[PDB]
Design a protein around this ligand. Structure first.
Ligand SMILES: *[C@@H]1O[C@H](CO)[C@@H](O[C@@H]2O[C@H](CO)[C@@H](O[C@@H]3O[C@H](CO)[C@@H](O)[C@H](O)[C@@H]3O)[C@H](O)[C@H]2NC(C)=O)[C@H](O)[C@H]1NC(C)=O
Ligand SMILES: *[C@@H]1O[C@H](CO)[C@@H](O[C@@H]2O[C@H](CO)[C@@H](O[C@@H]3O[C@H](CO)[C@@H](O)[C@H](O)[C@@H]3O)[C@H](O)[C@H]2NC(C)=O)[C@H](O)[C@H]1NC(C)=O
Ligand SMILES: *[C@@H]1O[C@H](CO)[C@@H](O[C@@H]2O[C@H](CO)[C@@H](O)[C@H](O)[C@H]2NC(C)=O)[C@H](O)[C@H]1NC(C)=O
Ligand SMILES: *[C@@H]1O[C@H](CO)[C@@H](O[C@@H]2O[C@H](CO)[C@@H](O)[C@H](O)[C@H]2NC(C)=O)[C@H](O)[C@H]1NC(C)=O
Ligand SMILES: *[C@@H]1O[C@H](CO)[C@@H](O[C@@H]2O[C@H](CO)[C@@H](O)[C@H](O)[C@H]2NC(C)=O)[C@H](O)[C@H]1NC(C)=O
Ligand SMILES: *[C@@H]1O[C@H](CO)[C@@H](O[C@@H]2O[C@H](CO)[C@@H](O)[C@H](O)[C@H]2NC(C)=O)[C@H](O)[C@H]1NC(C)=O
Ligand SMILES: *[C@@H]1O[C@H](CO)[C@@H](O[C@@H]2O[C@H](CO)[C@@H](O)[C@H](O)[C@H]2NC(C)=O)[C@H](O)[C@H]1NC(C)=O
Ligand SMILES: *[C@@H]1O[C@H](CO)[C@@H](O[C@@H]2O[C@H](CO)[C@@H](O)[C@H](O)[C@H]2NC(C)=O)[C@H](O)[C@H]1NC(C)=O
Ligand SMILES: *[C@@H]1O[C@H](CO)[C@@H](O)[C@H](O)[C@H]1NC(C)=O
Ligand SMILES: *[C@@H]1O[C@H](CO)[C@@H](O)[C@H](O)[C@H]1NC(C)=O
Ligand SMILES: *[C@@H]1O[C@H](CO)[C@@H](O)[C@H](O)[C@H]1NC(C)=O
Ligand SMILES: *[C@@H]1O[C@H](CO)[C@@H](O)[C@H](O)[C@H]1NC(C)=O
Ligand SMILES: *[C@@H]1O[C@H](CO)[C@@H](O)[C@H](O)[C@H]1NC(C)=O
Ligand SMILES: *[C@@H]1O[C@H](CO)[C@@H](O)[C@H](O)[C@H]1NC(C)=O
Ligand SMILES: *[C@@H]1O[C@H](CO)[C@@H](O)[C@H](O)[C@H]1NC(C)=O
Ligand SMILES: *[C@@H]1O[C@H](CO)[C@@H](O)[C@H](O)[C@H]1NC(C)=O
Ligand SMILES: *[C@@H]1O[C@H](CO)[C@@H](O)[C@H](O)[C@H]1NC(C)=O
Ligand SMILES: *[C@@H]1O[C@H](CO)[C@@H](O)[C@H](O)[C@H]1NC(C)=O
Ligand SMILES: *[C@@H]1O[C@H](CO)[C@@H](O)[C@H](O)[C@H]1NC(C)=O
Ligand SMILES: *[C@@H]1O[C@H](CO)[C@@H](O)[C@H](O)[C@H]1NC(C)=O
Ligand SMILES: *[C@@H]1O[C@H](CO)[C@@H](O)[C@H](O)[C@H]1NC(C)=O
Ligand SMILES: *[C@@H]1O[C@H](CO)[C@@H](O)[C@H](O)[C@H]1NC(C)=O
Lengths: 121, 121, 444, 111
């Protein structure tokens, strides 16, 4: 189970290696600087997105957005055992923009307001 | 063991059309070259068509006696060769054979199928 | 039931991407000056059940290697001596000596007026030149390309000997390597591994044949960008080496003069002993076996019942019509005829082979307009041993109207040399974020 | 097209005798120093069998009694000794160019 050794594995099996994958995410002088700056800017963008979702403290988290069955006509056991993450990512690639927008609107925007009201009272 | 099997023969009304087929076996069709010839006791043997491989853009050649009324095509994925004909004339009556070039350099019809009867009237 | 969106991080998913890769290496013109120390044992992780597609013809790694090489060649010449003062009347005559001869006039005895350390004084010198280095003004001569470009002398202390270069991914990226055999450089690869870095690749500059490259694992592999287009080069990778022995038999000597206050120039002095033509020896039997393997593999694509022929290039510039070497610091051009002279009808042709070669001191390696380099002559007898690892062939036919086809050696495009080593490698970007339907809920 | 002439149209040959069938192309069949004339043998109800290739080389499985000959525009097939097993139609072919040509087939019989 080296880096990306999980790539051919079922989506469920792959969950065992998430930590390992995370560890590997982080004029000649100009070439070095452009590559390094981009690696950092990219890294931070992913972390900011999790921070909006409130999931930044975890590799795995749950959300309050319900699944739209039209995104994929499959059973839970079907997805977790009969597919790889590579196949899955392609299958729902049309809806990733929608899901990200829903996570912010349905959870982040709603929860911060309700918690503020409780704090205010 | 190389075998060729012809099919699709039979009696067809003049001015009509039909398709003959040849099934390749015992060799890879994709890497060789294929030819069709016909025979009648009135004329003896006559060459009618040839088909080339992919680097040659599947170019084809026909005898002047059949050109424009006959067409040759192949399906590399199914190991088959087809000879299409239309605007049939009584003169086209004869036995048609699926053939192979055989010996390298010394192009020759080293292998023949059993052949099939075609009659036009 | 009610399915919910979940988020996973560290997900093993990758996408096609282009990024700058960095060189590593174990004076010299090559990249080792810019490079950092290598990983002596690069790690490789095999991936099971992975069918990732490769396409060598679109591979960006080729362009990155090309640009690094051009920059390095130029960088080595920046401190070096300018030869602009040499464009003079340069009167010359025939060299007379004990010779086996060559084309008549191949060597010239020239004399000319040069500057000295003081601008107040001039000196008269003489030197030997190759016919290729000069043209007639109208006897009076001119150094070739004095009408086109400045000429820079290569620094004598800088070696041209190749140094293996490894390329490594930046963080967030990984390099995939195809493990398949008999792979033609395109389509899905049935077995894929992930590596931090590539195997070391030596820069090699050559034409019509590939030198010092990798061998095919089992059988000779034939590939081209478009097999139906006769314009395209066909690359052939051999599964065996063919050894070639090249030599420059003449006992040349080197003399030098100071030019101006800041620089010095080296030139060919008297040649000691008999003057003989440069040449290369290859085994005939070995070459005959090699051609038989290539022909057998060509038939698998071009079909049976074809006549396969080979011939020399019909024309074009000396730089592309002949085989080129850079060895010992000398530049060789060899005719290659006798390697490519055959007809194959019956799976057979219908000791050593010696090829003639020529030496030129003024070169333009990258075929750039307005550029030129003068190599200093190298003293003493030069011998080089190398192995042929592949061929560049072109179709002069495209014939569909006959039972024959003829092939001729290609060249003039360096990218095709590098493609023979980089075809196994692909660059991908790692995207750790993904989502899934698994049911769960959170308190608010 | 390149026209072949073949003769005799038929011949009767007694057992043990030599039989000869001539073939004369309108244009030379030769290329790269090698003849491209081929010969076939045929019996009723069956496809032709390749007999001789490159005007001299017996096809695989072909008995020694069948011998090719000639060059340029003059070729012939020589069969000896004649046997009843040799009764067949015979054809010459020019394979050098597209279209490939045949014609003038000959009937060989026992006398
Ligand atoms: C290296 O070899 C592979 C095969 O191992 C080549 O893949 C082949 O590519 C051709 C052209 O796309 C495929 O031809 C097919 O044509 C039909 C229409 O007649 C089209 O519908 C198919 O989608 C396809 O284009 C051929 O099937 C395919 N062979 C396979 C997939 O096994 C590849 O092109 C070769 N690379 C080079 C540079 O020659
Ligand atoms: C491909 O690699 C082979 C070696 O596997 C090269 O052959 C060898 O090349 C080296 C370097 O040019 C030769 O050595 C040199 O010798 C001279 C003279 O003593 C010395 O001054 C240099 O510093 C260096 O040591 C070596 O002699 C030669 N072969 C043998 C048997 O020694 C071949 O040249 C390479 N091809 C290309 C195109 O680079
Ligand atoms: C070296 O000598 C050769 C002759 O051995 C010179 O070549 C001759 O050039 C003249 C004048 O144009 C011709 O008339 C002859 O036919 C040439 N002789 C040959 C080719 O054998 C040559 O010019 C001298 N040096 C050079 C050419 O650089
Ligand atoms: C090239 O020409 C020069 C003269 O321009 C030659 O140098 C002279 O050669 C003659 C004999 O031919 C000697 O008598 C002189 O003493 C030499 N002058 C010197 C050494 O300053 C030179 O030898 C010629 N080179 C070749 C290879 O023939
Ligand atoms: C190098 O310079 C000298 C003069 O210092 C040149 O010698 C002259 O040659 C011409 C030939 O027509 C004579 O008319 C002159 O009389 C010579 N010298 C002088 C001072 O007039 C020599 O030719 C020059 N060399 C080159 C290659 O140009
Ligand atoms: C070019 O020459 C080198 C040195 O002889 C070859 O490297 C050897 O390759 C053989 C297999 O062909 C190995 O058994 C030897 O151990 C290698 N020698 C080493 C690594 O020092 C090389 O194969 C030749 N051409 C190639 C490799 O394409
Ligand atoms: C071209 O045809 C030849 C000959 O059929 C193929 O190989 C040989 O044919 C002979 C008899 O003539 C057999 O005994 C052989 O087994 C065949 N090959 C071998 C290796 O023995 C050859 O494969 C054909 N070439 C292509 C590309 O299809
Ligand atoms: C490579 O070798 C060939 C064969 O020797 C050269 O072609 C010959 O050129 C000469 C001189 O004009 C002719 O007399 C011959 O008829 C040619 N031989 C042929 C066509 O077979 C060719 O010039 C050489 N290439 C180089 C760059 O020197
Ligand atoms: C590949 O598939 C096999 C089952 O056929 C499985 O046991 C193995 O774990 C899979 N490999 C990966 C990397 O998922
Ligand atoms: C699912 O997506 C479709 C298309 O956008 C939308 O019409 C539907 O309302 C969505 N269902 C949600 C909660 O169910
Ligand atoms: C998903 O559930 C349905 C329920 O009818 C079943 O028919 C189908 O086979 C299931 N799919 C898989 C992959 O188990
Ligand atoms: C996903 O998007 C791609 C690109 O528009 C499209 O080709 C594909 O059909 C889509 N998949 C769907 C709609 O399931
Ligand atoms: C320089 O001289 C060469 C001699 O071959 C000639 O071909 C070229 O046209 C010249 N260049 C210019 C710019 O005149
Ligand atoms: C090869 O060239 C032919 C003729 O132009 C073209 O039809 C075909 O698409 C090309 N094949 C490629 C680009 O893979
Ligand atoms: C042969 O050439 C050498 C080098 O130029 C020279 O020293 C020697 O005298 C020559 N021998 C003769 C001319 O007999
Ligand atoms: C090349 O072959 C020639 C002719 O046999 C021979 O004289 C020469 O010494 C050979 N060169 C080498 C390096 O063996
Ligand atoms: C090249 O030289 C080696 C010795 O270094 C020798 O064994 C080999 O036979 C030579 N090759 C030829 C073609 O002469
Ligand atoms: C090239 O082949 C031709 C034809 O066999 C031959 O006449 C010629 O001499 C050969 N050239 C060589 C061997 O240099
Ligand atoms: C090449 O031809 C010769 C002569 O017919 C034959 O003996 C040999 O087996 C052939 N080689 C084939 C595949 O190698
Ligand atoms: C070249 O190879 C052919 C085909 O294998 C062989 O028939 C011939 O004898 C070889 N020529 C030699 C070894 O000189
Ligand atoms: C030839 O070159 C060698 C060095 O490679 C040198 O020692 C020798 O003196 C030169 N000529 C001779 C010695 O005649
Ligand atoms: C074959 O002949 C046709 C004309 O019938 C011509 O257009 C085509 O270019 C020819 N092909 C070759 C390779 O010469």
């Amino acid at each position: 189970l080296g880096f990306l050794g999980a790539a051919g594995s079922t989506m469920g099996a792959a969950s065992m290696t998430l930590t390992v994958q995370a560890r590997n995410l982080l004029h000649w002088g100009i070439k070095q600087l452009q590559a390094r700056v981009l690696a950092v800017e990219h890294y931070l963008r992913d972390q900011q997105l999790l921070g909006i979702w409130g999931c930044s403290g975890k590799l795995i988290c749950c959300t309050n957005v319900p699944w739209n069955s039209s995104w994929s006509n499959r059973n839970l056991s079907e997805i977790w055992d009969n597919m790889t993450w590579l196949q899955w990512d392609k299958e729902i690639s049309n809806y990733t923009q929608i899901i990200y927008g829903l996570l912010e609107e349905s959870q982040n925007q709603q929860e911060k307001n309700e918690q503020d009201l409780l704090a205010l009272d | 063991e190389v075998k060729l099997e012809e099919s699709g023969g039979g009696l067809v009304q003049a001015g009509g059309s039909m398709k003959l087929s040849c099934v390749a076996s015992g060799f890879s069709l994709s890497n060789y070259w294929m030819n069709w010839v016909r025979q009648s006791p009135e004329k003896g043997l006559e060459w009618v068509a040839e088909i080339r491989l992919k680097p040659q853009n599947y170019a084809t050649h026909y005898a002047e006696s059949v050109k424009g009324r006959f067409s040759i095509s192949r399906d590399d994925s199914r190991s088959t060769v087809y000879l299409q004909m239309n605007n049939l004339r009584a003169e086209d009556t004869g036995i048609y054979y699926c053939t192979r070039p055989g010996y390298y350099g010394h192009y020759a019809m080293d292998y023949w199928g059993q052949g099939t009867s075609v009659t036009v009237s | 039931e009610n399915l919910w969106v979940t988020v996973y991080y560290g997900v093993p998913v990758w996408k096609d991407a282009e990024t700058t890769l960095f060189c590593a290496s174990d004076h010299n013109v090559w990249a080792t000056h810019a490079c950092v120390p290598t990983d002596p044992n690069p790690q490789e992780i095999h991936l099971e059940n992975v069918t990732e597609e490769f396409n060598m013809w679109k591979n960006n790694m080729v362009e990155q290697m090309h640009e690094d090489i051009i920059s390095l060649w130029d960088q080595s010449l920046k401190p070096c001596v300018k030869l602009t003062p040499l464009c003079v009347t340069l009167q010359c005559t025939n060299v007379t000596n004990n010779i086996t001869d060559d084309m008549r006039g191949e060597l010239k005895n020239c004399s000319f007026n040069m500057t000295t350390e003081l601008r107040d004084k001039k000196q008269k010198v003489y030197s030997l030149f190759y016919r290729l280095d000069v043209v007639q003004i109208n006897k009076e001569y001119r150094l070739i390309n004095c009408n086109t470009s400045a000429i820079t002398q290569a620094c004598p202390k800088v070696s041209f000997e190749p140094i293996p270069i490894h390329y490594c991914a930046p963080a967030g990226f990984a390099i995939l390597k195809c493990k398949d055999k008999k792979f033609n450089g395109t389509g899905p690869c049935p077995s894929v591994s992930t590596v931090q870095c590539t195997h070391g690749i030596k820069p090699v500059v050559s034409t019509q044949l590939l030198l010092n490259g990798s061998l095919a694992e089992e059988e000779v592999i034939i590939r081209s960008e478009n097999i139906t287009n006769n314009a395209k080069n066909i690359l052939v990778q051999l599964n065996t080496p063919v050894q070639i022995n090249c030599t420059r038999p003449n006992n040349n000597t080197v003399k030098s003069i100071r030019i101006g206050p800041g620089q010095a120039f080296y030139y060919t002095g008297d040649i000691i002993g008999d003057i003989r033509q440069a040449h290369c020896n290859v085994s005939k039997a070995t070459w005959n076996e090699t051609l038989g393997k290539v022909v057998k593999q060509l038939r698998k694509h071009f079909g049976n019942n074809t006549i396969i022929r080979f011939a020399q290039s019909s024309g074009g510039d000396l730089e592309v019509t002949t085989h080129s070497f850079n060895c010992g610091g000398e530049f060789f051009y060899c005719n290659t005829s006798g390697l490519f002279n055959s007809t194959w009808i019956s799976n057979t042709s219908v000791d050593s082979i010696t090829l003639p070669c020529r030496i030129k001191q003024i070169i333009n390696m990258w075929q750039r307009i307005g550029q030129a380099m003068y190599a200093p002559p190298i003293q003493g007898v030069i011998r080089c041993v190398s192995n042929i690892t592949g061929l560049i062939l072109t179709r002069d036919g495209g014939s569909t109207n006959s039972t024959t086809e003829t092939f001729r050696p290609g060249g003039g495009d360096m990218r095709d040399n590098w493609r023979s080593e980089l075809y196994k490698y692909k660059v991908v970007k790692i995207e750790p974020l993904g989502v899934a339907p698994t049911r769960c809920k959170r308190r608010v | 097209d390149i026209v072949l002439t073949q003769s005799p149209a038929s011949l009767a040959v007694s057992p043990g005798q030599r039989a000869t069938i001539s073939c004369r192309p309108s244009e030379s069949v030769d290329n790269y120093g090698i003849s491209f004339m081929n010969w076939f043998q045929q019996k009723p109800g069956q496809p032709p069998k390749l007999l001789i290739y490159a005007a001299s080389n017996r096809g695989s499985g072909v008995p020694a009694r069948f011998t090719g000959s000639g060059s340029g525009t003059d070729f012939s097939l020589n069969i000896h000794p004649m046997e009843e097993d040799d009764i067949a139609m015979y054809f010459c072919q020019q394979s050098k160019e597209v279209p490939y040509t045949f014609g003038g087939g000959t009937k060989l019989e026992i006398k």
